Scaffold this active site. Structure first.
Site, PDB file in Angstrom:
ATOM      1  N   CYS A   1     -19.859  -9.051 -45.915  1.00 12.40           N
ATOM      2  CA  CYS A   1     -18.384  -9.246 -45.961  1.00 12.40           C
ATOM      3  C   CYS A   1     -17.930 -10.689 -45.905  1.00 12.40           C
ATOM      4  O   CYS A   1     -18.761 -11.582 -45.617  1.00 12.40           O
ATOM      5  CB  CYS A   1     -17.648  -8.468 -44.827  1.00 12.40           C
ATOM      6  SG  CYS A   1     -17.966  -9.251 -43.212  1.00 12.40           S
TER       7      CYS A   1
ATOM      8  N   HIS B   1     -19.173  -4.925 -31.047  1.00 13.20           N
ATOM      9  CA  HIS B   1     -20.267  -5.362 -30.138  1.00 13.20           C
ATOM     10  C   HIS B   1     -19.906  -6.620 -29.326  1.00 13.20           C
ATOM     11  O   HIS B   1     -20.465  -7.708 -29.538  1.00 13.20           O
ATOM     12  CB  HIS B   1     -21.545  -5.597 -30.938  1.00 13.20           C
ATOM     13  CG  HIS B   1     -22.088  -4.322 -31.547  1.00 13.20           C
ATOM     14  ND1 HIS B   1     -22.731  -4.298 -32.753  1.00 13.20           N
ATOM     15  CD2 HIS B   1     -22.099  -3.033 -31.035  1.00 13.20           C
ATOM     16  CE1 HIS B   1     -23.127  -3.044 -33.002  1.00 13.20           C
ATOM     17  NE2 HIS B   1     -22.782  -2.252 -31.932  1.00 13.20           N
TER      18      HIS B   1
ATOM     19  N   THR C   1     -23.121  -5.078 -43.852  1.00 16.45           N
ATOM     20  CA  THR C   1     -22.031  -6.080 -44.004  1.00 16.45           C
ATOM     21  C   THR C   1     -22.316  -7.410 -43.271  1.00 16.45           C
ATOM     22  O   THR C   1     -21.743  -8.403 -43.573  1.00 16.45           O
ATOM     23  CB  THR C   1     -20.643  -5.565 -43.557  1.00 16.45           C
ATOM     24  OG1 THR C   1     -20.721  -5.199 -42.169  1.00 16.45           O
ATOM     25  CG2 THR C   1     -20.117  -4.370 -44.425  1.00 16.45           C
TER      26      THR C   1
ATOM     27  N   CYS D   1     -14.335  -0.292 -40.207  1.00 11.56           N
ATOM     28  CA  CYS D   1     -13.723  -1.384 -41.008  1.00 11.56           C
ATOM     29  C   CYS D   1     -13.627  -0.904 -42.490  1.00 11.56           C
ATOM     30  O   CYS D   1     -14.562  -0.278 -43.043  1.00 11.56           O
ATOM     31  CB  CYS D   1     -14.620  -2.643 -40.852  1.00 11.56           C
ATOM     32  SG  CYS D   1     -13.884  -3.914 -41.955  1.00 11.56           S
TER      33      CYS D   1
ATOM     34  N   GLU E   1     -24.250   0.532 -37.948  1.00 12.40           N
ATOM     35  CA  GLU E   1     -23.703   0.535 -39.331  1.00 12.40           C
ATOM     36  C   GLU E   1     -24.715   1.162 -40.283  1.00 12.40           C
ATOM     37  O   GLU E   1     -24.341   1.886 -41.230  1.00 12.40           O
ATOM     38  CB  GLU E   1     -23.311  -0.857 -39.862  1.00 12.40           C
ATOM     39  CG  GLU E   1     -22.668  -0.865 -41.265  1.00 12.40           C
ATOM     40  CD  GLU E   1     -22.490  -2.266 -41.803  1.00 12.40           C
ATOM     41  OE1 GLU E   1     -22.588  -2.384 -43.054  1.00 12.40           O
ATOM     42  OE2 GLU E   1     -22.228  -3.208 -40.988  1.00 12.40           O
TER      43      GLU E   1
ATOM     44  N   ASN F   1     -23.876  -9.894 -36.452  1.00 16.92           N
ATOM     45  CA  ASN F   1     -23.383 -11.096 -37.143  1.00 16.92           C
ATOM     46  C   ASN F   1     -23.496 -12.325 -36.177  1.00 16.92           C
ATOM     47  O   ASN F   1     -23.748 -13.490 -36.666  1.00 16.92           O
ATOM     48  CB  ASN F   1     -21.926 -10.884 -37.644  1.00 16.92           C
ATOM     49  CG  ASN F   1     -20.900 -11.062 -36.512  1.00 16.92           C
ATOM     50  OD1 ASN F   1     -20.424 -12.145 -36.191  1.00 16.92           O
ATOM     51  ND2 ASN F   1     -20.547  -9.949 -35.924  1.00 16.92           N
TER      52      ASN F   1
HETATM   53  C1  LIG Z   1     -17.874  -3.226 -37.422  1.00 21.37           C
HETATM   54  C2  LIG Z   1     -18.273  -4.565 -37.287  1.00 21.37           C
HETATM   55  C3  LIG Z   1     -18.683  -5.876 -37.170  1.00 21.37           C
HETATM   56  C4  LIG Z   1     -18.020  -6.754 -36.172  1.00 21.37           C
HETATM   57  O1  LIG Z   1     -18.975  -7.355 -35.313  1.00 21.37           O
HETATM   58  P1  LIG Z   1     -19.901  -6.573 -34.365  1.00 21.37           P
HETATM   59  O2  LIG Z   1     -19.102  -5.556 -33.622  1.00 21.37           O
HETATM   60  O3  LIG Z   1     -20.425  -7.652 -33.540  1.00 21.37           O
HETATM   61  O4  LIG Z   1     -20.947  -5.806 -35.290  1.00 21.37           O
HETATM   62  P2  LIG Z   1     -22.294  -6.309 -35.944  1.00 21.37           P
HETATM   63  O5  LIG Z   1     -22.225  -7.727 -36.212  1.00 21.37           O
HETATM   64  O6  LIG Z   1     -23.355  -5.920 -34.967  1.00 21.37           O
HETATM   65  O7  LIG Z   1     -22.395  -5.507 -37.114  1.00 21.37           O
HETATM   66  S1  SF4 Z   2     -17.669  -8.276 -39.746  1.00 23.36           S
HETATM   67 FE1  SF4 Z   2     -16.833  -7.773 -41.802  1.00 23.36          FE
HETATM   68  S2  SF4 Z   2     -17.259  -5.624 -42.349  1.00 23.36           S
HETATM   69 FE2  SF4 Z   2     -17.517  -5.968 -40.081  1.00 23.36          FE
HETATM   70  S3  SF4 Z   2     -15.525  -5.465 -39.061  1.00 23.36           S
HETATM   71 FE3  SF4 Z   2     -15.482  -7.682 -39.554  1.00 23.36          FE
HETATM   72  S4  SF4 Z   2     -14.516  -7.857 -41.598  1.00 23.36           S
HETATM   73 FE4  SF4 Z   2     -15.239  -5.673 -41.338  1.00 23.36          FE
END
Ligand SMILES: C=C=CCOP(=O)(O)OP(=O)(O)O
Ligand code: SF4
EC number: 1.17.7.4
Length: 309
Positions: A197, A41, A167, A96, A126, A227
């Site tokens: 994670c 994202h 996660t 992941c 997810e 995240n």
């Molecule tokens: C796959 C994965 C996480 C990496 O960050 P991200 O692509 O920002 O995803 P979320 O934080 O929205 O879950």
């Molecule tokens: S935020 Fe955590 S679970 Fe998601 S891709 Fe990164 S290491 Fe993997």
């Protein structure tokens, strides 16, 4: 104005692998490479890859026969995987490993016909993927986002019940949901703490330390990154003004006028070039050399599959 940088910040191991999977596919096979959902994202990473020939779709029905399709880092349901498998597609999976670990547990619970509860945000990809590992009609798969959700949930057999988490949640809000789950369902089984994670837990710990020093926190990350939104929320709840931004162009001068200490961090899907450009803009607005905070060391790397070296 002092500029402080959170540590750790920015890319995690799953994001660096996922993006490498798409770039290597592009380099080995040419455009187009189809990718189910944003690989990660982040608007700059996704725009980058689109300009190089990746095509991001939401449904497998948008991909042509014979195409190469990559699933995003957030994972996919068995239904999606089966849909791809039934079609002409060459598939590489950028999920992941730390999402796959949760998927294996939900599949185990499903095979046993024992009910599972996922803690996570409705409609996040997810959560769709993880709920999508449960198929046994004799059991059950339930989603809860808050203690109130727990207080309203009824299940079929609370003696045989397990829980899992997304996660990229708030460590603190998830701990409140788990306390409620154990009070309502005292026999529930789960991991020692949660499925949050290392990268999520570490970046939240780092932003807590950043917000203790900084008056304003900028979090580099896209609006639909879970995240990244947790890092901004964490600083806001400490009473700091905090802003989620995609790039330096988003910084409004009023946010840092007369501020003596500004903190910068980045979500797990945001590349370091965006943080560099943000620091450069804060320096135009009066800031000095960026000072990295001391932080917890990260050492985990996840390799691309051998097929894509
Ligand atoms: C796959 C994965 C996480 C990496 O960050 P991200 O692509 O920002 O995803 P979320 O934080 O929205 O879950
Ligand atoms: S935020 Fe955590 S679970 Fe998601 S891709 Fe990164 S290491 Fe993997």
């Amino acid at each position: 104005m002092q500029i402080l940088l959170a540590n750790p910040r920015g890319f995690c191991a799953g994001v660096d692998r996922a993006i490498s999977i798409v770039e290597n596919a592009l380099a080995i096979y040419g455009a187009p490479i189809y990718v189910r959902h944003e690989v990660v994202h982040n608007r700059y990473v996704v725009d980058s890859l689109r300009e190089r020939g990746a095509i991001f779709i939401e449904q497998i029905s948008e991909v042509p026969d014979g195409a190469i399709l990559i699933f995003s880092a957030h994972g996919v349901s068995q239904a999606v995987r089966n849909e791809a498998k039934s079609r002409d597609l060459t598939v590489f999976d950028a999920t992941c490993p730390l999402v796959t670990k949760v998927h294996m547990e939900v599949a185990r619970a499903s095979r046993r016909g024992e009910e599972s509860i996922l803690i996570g945000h409705a409609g996040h990809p997810e959560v769709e993927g993880t709920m999508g590992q449960y198929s046994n009609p004799e059991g059950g798969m339930y989603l809860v986002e808050s203690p109130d959700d727990v207080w309203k949930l009824t299940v079929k057999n609370e003696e045989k019940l397990s829980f899992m988490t997304q996660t990229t949640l708030s460590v603190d809000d998830t701990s409140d949901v788990i306390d409620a789950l154990r009070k309502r369902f005292p026999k529930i089984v789960g991991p020692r703490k949660d499925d949050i994670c290392y990268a999520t837990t570490n970046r939240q710990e780092a932003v807590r330390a950043l917000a203790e020093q900084a008056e304003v926190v900028l979090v580099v990350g896209s609006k639909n990154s879970s995240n990244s939104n947790r890092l901004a929320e964490l600083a806001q709840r400490m009473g700091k003004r905090a802003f989620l931004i995609d790039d330096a162009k988003d910084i409004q001068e009023e946010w840092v006028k007369e501020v003596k200490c500004v903190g910068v961090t980045a979500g797990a899907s945001a590349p370091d070039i965006l943080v560099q450009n943000v620091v450069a803009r804060l320096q135009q607005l009066g800031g000095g050399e960026a000072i990295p905070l001391e932080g917890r060391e990260e050492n985990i790397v996840f390799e691309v599959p051998k097929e894509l070296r």
